[PDB]
């Protein structure tokens, strides 16, 4: 019902009972305080408008899907689509004060992979990991999400710019379903929208910008749950199995992805360039079909040939080594080159 919070958790791995069970870093701050794991969301009047970009260092996101401080963004992917590597990039190449990761996963190996990632991360001294494995009870799996969120809420009240990751909402929701069945005004199912409303920028405080993962099954298809979360969140990033099998990483399909706060967090010249780039992406997808139909013949259509010769520079812009991060200025310089 209550959990540890505070700067003393930075570098720690926390289990569903809210106890530190491992460490991927040690810091000289030992602050440990206690807070309830369930808290009402902010009043509308306590929230600030999302108006400042949350930069990710990822070219396709910062140019076409720009996130804002306080936003909730869904990450939708099938099992082999690089969800975890994307999450690692979002941590490594963004600029948050503090990162809180809640893993509502399956095997301990997955957890251990994240711990060893964090052990070697530049961000290790500013991260907290909360986990629940498949072996823990459904109650414990749900609580891991609340604990992670409550830890983030403390850092927000202190004025920090916090990034929160919940992987995955899907396994959170399935645990919630089991907890509900154990019980049969309040439904155990309402714990999903009350969880998702907790992030945001506060007028009196800092912010929580939150990324929630959703699994797609079989083939990039949208669960009823996928549909419900999509409607609650402020946007979604879709990782395409097709793009991944083509070797494009990150496998973000920007034409099927959206940030709802985009026009609110970037300026006009950015808006113009992104719109132009999206039109070019659309033209490339049309040409790709024509090529598959065997109807593309060089020299027959000058506009088609011009689009053909842009495919390479566009793919190069979208593609990104997971170890590399780009500044906003760099990203906008690069996208300008591609549309020219």
Curated annotation (Swiss-Prot):
> What's the EC number here?
7.4.2.8
Q: What is the effect of changing residue 197 to R?
A: Reduces oligomerization. Lack of ATPase activity. Abolishes invasion and hemolysis phenotype. Low levels of secreted IpaC
As its record notes, the protein acts as a catalyst of: ATP + H2O + cellular proteinSide 1 = ADP + phosphate + cellular proteinSide 2
Q: Which GO terms describe its cellular component?
A: cytoplasm; type III protein secretion system complex
Q: Which GO terms describe its molecular function?
A: ATP binding; ATP hydrolysis activity; identical protein binding; protein-exporting ATPase activity; proton-transporting ATP synthase activity, rotational mechanism
Where in or outside the cell is it found? Answer: Cytoplasm
- The question of whether Ribosomal protein is a record keyword is answered with no
Q: What is the effect of changing residue 85 to A?
A: Decrease in ATPase activity
UniProt keyword Transport present: yes
Keywords in alphabetical order, please: ATP-binding, Cytoplasm, Nucleotide-binding, Plasmid, Protein transport, Translocase, Transport, Virulence
Which biological process terms from the Gene Ontology are attached to this UniProt entry? protein secretion by the type III secretion system
Q: Provide the phenotype resulting from gene inactivation.
A: Mutant is defective for assembly of the needle and secretion of the translocon proteins IpaB/SctE and IpaC/SctB. Amount of the needle filament protein MxiH/SctF is greatly reduced. T3SS effector protein secretion is reduced in Shigella strains coexpressing wild-type and inactive Spa47/SctN.
| Protein origin, superkingdom | Bacteria
Tell me what the record says results from residue 81 to V: No change in ATPase activity
Q: What is the effect of changing residue 218 to A?
A: Decrease in ATPase activity
Control of this protein's activity: Oligomerization increases ATPase activity. Monomeric forms exhibit low-level ATPase activity by forming short-lived oligomers with active site contributions from at least two protomers. In contrast, oligomers exhibit enhanced ATP hydrolysis rates that likely result from multiple preformed active sites within the oligomeric complex. Oligomerization is important for both enzyme activation and T3SS function.
- Quaternary data: The core secretion machinery of the T3SS is composed of approximately 20 different proteins, including cytoplasmic components, a base, an export apparatus and a needle. This subunit is part of the cytosolic complex. Forms homohexamers. Interacts directly with MxiN/SctL (stator protein) and Spa13/SctO (stalk protein). Can form a soluble complex with Spa33/SctQ, MxiN/SctL and MxiK/SctK.
The family annotation for this protein states: Belongs to the ATPase alpha/beta chains family. T3SS ATPase subfamily.
Comment, domains: The N-terminal domain is required for oligomerization and ATPase activity. The six N-terminal residues are necessary for proper oligomer formation, though their absence does not entirely preclude oligomerization. The extreme N-terminus is also required for interaction with MxiN/SctL. The N-terminal domain, not ATPase activity, is responsible for localization of Spa47/SctN to the injectisome. The binding of ATP induces a conformational change of a highly conserved luminal loop, facilitating ATP hydrolysis.
Q: What is this protein called?
A: Type 3 secretion system ATPase
- Species this chain originates from: Shigella flexneri
Gene that this polypeptide is encoded by: sctN
Which part of the full protein is shown? Answer: 83 to 430 of 430
């Amino acid at each position: 019902l209550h959990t540890q919070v505070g700067r003393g958790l930075l570098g720690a791995v926390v289990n569903p009972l809210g106890e530190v069970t491992d460490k991927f870093a040690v810091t000289d701050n030992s602050e440990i305080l206690y807070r309830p794991v369930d808290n009402a969301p902010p009043l509308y009047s306590e929230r600030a408008a999302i108006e400042k970009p949350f930069l990710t260092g990822i070219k396709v996101i910062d140019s076409l899907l720009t996130c804002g401080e306080g936003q909730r963004m869904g990450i939708f992917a099938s099992a082999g689509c690089g969800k975890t590597f994307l999450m690692n990039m979002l941590i490594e190449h963004s600029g948050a004060d503090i990162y809180v990761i809640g893993l509502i996963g399956e095997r301990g190996r997955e957890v251990t992979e994240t711990v060893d990632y964090l052990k070697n991360s530049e961000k290790k001294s500013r991260c907290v990991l909360v986990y629940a494995t498949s072996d823990y009870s459904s109650v414990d799996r749900c609580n891991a999400a609340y604990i992670a969120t409550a830890i983030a809420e403390f850092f927000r009240t202190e004025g920090h710019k916090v990034a929160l990751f919940i992987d995955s909402l899907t396994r959170y929701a399935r645990a919630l379903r089991d907890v509900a069945l154990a019980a049969g005004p309040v439904s155990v199912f309402d714990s999903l929208p009350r969880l998702l409303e907790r992030p945001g920028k506060l007028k009196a405080g800092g912010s929580i910008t939150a990324f929630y993962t959703v699994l797609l099954e079989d083939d990039d298809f949208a669960d009823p749950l996928a549909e419900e979360v999509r409607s609650i969140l402020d946007g979604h990033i879709y990782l395409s199995r097709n793009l991944a099998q083509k070797g494009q990483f990150p496998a973000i399909d920007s034409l099927k992805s959206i940030s709802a706060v985009f026009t609110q967090v970037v300026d006009e010249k950015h808006r113009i360039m992104a719109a132009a780039f999206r039109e070019l992406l659309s033209e490339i997808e049309e040409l790709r079909t024509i090529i598959d139909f065997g109807e593309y013949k060089p020299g027959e259509n000058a506009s088609q040939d011009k689009i053909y010769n842009k495919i390479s520079v566009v793919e190069s812009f979208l593609k990104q080594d997971y170890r590399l991060g780009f500044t906003y200025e760099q990203t906008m310089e690069l996208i300008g080159e591609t549309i020219r």
